[PDB]
Amino acid sequence: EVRTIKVFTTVDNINLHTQVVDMSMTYGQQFGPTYLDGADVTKIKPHNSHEGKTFYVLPNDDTLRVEAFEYYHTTDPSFLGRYMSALNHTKKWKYPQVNGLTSIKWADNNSYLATALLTLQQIELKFNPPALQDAYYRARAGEAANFCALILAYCNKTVGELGDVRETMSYLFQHANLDSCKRVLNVVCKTCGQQQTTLKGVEAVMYMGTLSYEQFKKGVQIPCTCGKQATKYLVQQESPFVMMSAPPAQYELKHGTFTCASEYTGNYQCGHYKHITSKETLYCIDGALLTKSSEYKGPITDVFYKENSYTTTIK
Amino acid sequence: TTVDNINLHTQFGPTYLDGADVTKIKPHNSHEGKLPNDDTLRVEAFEYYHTTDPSFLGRYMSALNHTKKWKYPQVNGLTSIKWADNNSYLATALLTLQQIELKFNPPALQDAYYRARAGEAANFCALILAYCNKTVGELGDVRETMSYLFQHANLDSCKRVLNVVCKTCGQQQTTLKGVEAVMYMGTLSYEQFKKGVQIPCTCGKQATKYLVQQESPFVMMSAPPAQYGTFTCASEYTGNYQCGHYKHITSKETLYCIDGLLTKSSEYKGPITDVFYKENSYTTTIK
Ligand SMILES: CC(=O)Nc1cccc(CNC(=O)C2CCN([C@H](C)c3cccc4ccccc34)CC2)c1
Ligand SMILES: CC(=O)Nc1cccc(CNC(=O)C2CCN([C@H](C)c3cccc4ccccc34)CC2)c1
Ligand SMILES: [Zn+2]
Ligand SMILES: [Zn+2]
Numbered sequence: 001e002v003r004t005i006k007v008f009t010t011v012d013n014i015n016l017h018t019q020v021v022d023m024s025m026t027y028g029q030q031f032g033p034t035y036l037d038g039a040d041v042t043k044i045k046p047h048n049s050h051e052g053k054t055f056y057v058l059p060n061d062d063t064l065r066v067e068a069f070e071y072y073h074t075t076d077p078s079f080l081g082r083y084m085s086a087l088n089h090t091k092k093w094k095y096p097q098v099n100g101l102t103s104i105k106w107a108d109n110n111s112y113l114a115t116a117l118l119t120l121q122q123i124e125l126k127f128n129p130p131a132l133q134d135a136y137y138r139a140r141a142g143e144a145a146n147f148c149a150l151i152l153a154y155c156n157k158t159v160g161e162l163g164d165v166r167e168t169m170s171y172l173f174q175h176a177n178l179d180s181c182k183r184v185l186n187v188v189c190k191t192c193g194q195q196q197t198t199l200k201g202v203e204a205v206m207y208m209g210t211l212s213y214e215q216f217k218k219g220v221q222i223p224c225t226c227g228k229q230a231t232k233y234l235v236q237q238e239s240p241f242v243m244m245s246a247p248p249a250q251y252e253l254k255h256g257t258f259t260c261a262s263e264y265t266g267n268y269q270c271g272h273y274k275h276i277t278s279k280e281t282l283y284c285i286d287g288a289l290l291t292k293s294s295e296y297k298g299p300i301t302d303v304f305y306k307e308n309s310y311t312t313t314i315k
Numbered sequence: 316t317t318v319d320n321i322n323l324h325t326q327f328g329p330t331y332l333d334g335a336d337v338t339k340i341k342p343h344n345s346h347e348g349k350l351p352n353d354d355t356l357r358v359e360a361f362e363y364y365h366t367t368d369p370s371f372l373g374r375y376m377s378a379l380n381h382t383k384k385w386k387y388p389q390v391n392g393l394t395s396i397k398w399a400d401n402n403s404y405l406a407t408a409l410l411t412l413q414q415i416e417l418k419f420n421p422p423a424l425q426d427a428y429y430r431a432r433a434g435e436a437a438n439f440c441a442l443i444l445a446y447c448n449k450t451v452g453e454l455g456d457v458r459e460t461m462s463y464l465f466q467h468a469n470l471d472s473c474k475r476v477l478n479v480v481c482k483t484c485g486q487q488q489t490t491l492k493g494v495e496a497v498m499y500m501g502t503l504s505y506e507q508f509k510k511g512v513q514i515p516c517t518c519g520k521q522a523t524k525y526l527v528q529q530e531s532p533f534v535m536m537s538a539p540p541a542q543y544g545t546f547t548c549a550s551e552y553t554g555n556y557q558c559g560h561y562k563h564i565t566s567k568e569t570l571y572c573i574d575g576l577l578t579k580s581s582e583y584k585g586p587i588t589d590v591f592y593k594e595n596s597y598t599t600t601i602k
Contacts, residue, residue: 075420076493078471174448201370203448247557
């Protein structure tokens with residue numbers, strides 16, 4: 001007749017919701033889309049081994065919608081489904097510790113995430129969504145599948161898709177605490193005069209255009225609207241890091257003068273990322289592969305630098 | 316007092332007057348009678364903007380101080396922006412939004428989009444800039460801006476199923492939702508995506524991916540610039556990755572090109588970066 005078991009559904013693995021299930025129905029019928037440790041179990045009927053387990057459902061009642069928002073800080077209805085679908089893959093990657101950092105053995109065209117994950121472990125960053133804070137702790141410890149799947153979901157990228165690092169840090173920074181970050185710039189044009197500007201949030205820690213923090217501090221040449229080239233330079237920065245990005249170009253990472261950088265060999269549709277880190281010397285981390293050198297020149301796209309408080313001396 | 320111009324609180328901390336940062340200015344006599352640091356302002360601000368960035372309002376105000384000085388003529392029935400401050404990407408975005416079926420979630424974007432369609436896009440422009448985390452005058456990209464705004468749009472009814480056939484692995488159907496359901500990066504042609512484009516598979520071979528099923532009111536196809544009544548609209552980019560200019564192409568009674576200026580033609584070939592197509596329900600025929 002009626003054969004049934006007890007489960008918990010959840011969206012955050014924090015609030016669990018007891019349900020009973022008629023074994024005579026596949027999970028979807030009773031819950032909608034249903035997952036077991038990443039596996040889409042919507043179309044399976046309950047096993048005796050399921051008694052007492054926990055299942056992610058979708059926020060299909062008002063209570064779950066609010067819990068999901070408090071945990072993930074997103075209101076895209078498809079977020080949890082897209083996250084779970086990614087997790088079915090990221091749980092299958094291997095995440096070896098290479099030079100003290102969690103990287104990822106190459107799989108499923110994930111080179112940009114490996115380099116993002118290594119970068120994330122070297123910069124001062126506290127996340128706001130509890131899901132990312134929790135998954136990031138796990139990632140730093142070496143169990144990074146959930147972290148990788150959440151980055152994919154927040155970035156609207158699917159498993160196997162070609163990725164760009166600059167876009168990922170910007171997406172993640174929208175979800176990071178940059179409250180104390182401050183950037184002050186002056187732009188001096190021989191025609192137009194001087195203009196100071198203050199920037200906040202992601203733009204206060206990100207600049208696209210030069211890899212050299214020294215050149216940014218000294219002044220970089222950009223076009224002015226009057227037609228002249230003006231020079232823009234950094235007057236004041238209060239932040240724990242900066243990220244500099246540019247189209248891939250041959251570049252000289254010198255030991256000890258930056259934190260880490262990303263190297264891109266390829267073209268705009270297909271290319272490969274490697275991570276370069278400055279430790280006692282220069283290490284090139286490529287998934288599980290590791291190399292060392294005293295100097296480096298290669299096709300660099302992003303350079304990260306340490307910071308606390310900077311004020312220019314150029315008046 | 317206010318953070319949203321809807322919920323008012325009788326009364327400072329950070330203070331703004333019609334876009335100009337006046338926190339550090341003292342009131343003038345002409346000012347008589349006219350940041351979210353308490354719970355009333357925190358709740359009102361979140362319900363209106365759908366962001367919890369503490370710095371959001373400062374960047375929105377800074378942008379509005381500039382965008383209120385732009386001019387916004389109606390060209391071929393759409394609000395554009397007369398050129399100022401390297402706003403060609405913002406101009407092309409505003410012309411594009413008014414031409415496809417899309418519903419916003421933050422009350423701020425619906426309200427600003429409605430005002431913009433009527434001709435008052437200053438508030439709308441400061442909101443686009445804040446959501447895309449750009450300051451006024453910055454060089455912008457259509458694909459990136461659209462990715463951020465679609466992140467803030469109701470694309471809930473959109474669904475996409477694709478199949479990938481690899482000579483080693485077999486066939487795999489994959490389902491996408493939200494932004495990935497309406498955007499494809501790799502080809503400008505919806506027809507080729509429906510018929511199939513060759514892209515890499517995880518085993519290292521190049522595989523062929525084609526569209527099995529699409530349910531949505533529009534699609535956006537983008538690719539790096541190349542020479543290129545069959546589409547709704549597209550963006551044309553002249554330049555290189557660091558410096559260039561956007562124009563807009565709309566397919567109506569003929570093909571019209573709006574560049575902040577407007578011309579027409581019966582045929583069109585140029586350096587296209589993004590192309591837009593109409594949809595309701597499409598299903599492929601390889602069965
Ligand atoms: C719109 C569209 O069609 N996107 C698309 C299509 C197919 C595959 C991919 C996935 N690959 C990417 O997204 C890349 C994007 C960025 N770059 C670096 C940072 C890079 C930066 C600047 C200039 C570059 C100029 C040349 C090469 C790289 C440049 C890394 C990879 C994306
Ligand atoms: C904080 C700050 O200042 N950020 C900043 C700085 C500089 C520039 C920009 C924005 N950059 C852009 O908008 C262009 C860049 C990319 N694409 C083009 C279509 C494009 C697409 C694909 C391959 C390409 C391959 C080669 C060339 C172009 C390619 C769109 C426009 C932002
Ligand atoms: Zn000038
Ligand atoms: Zn394969």
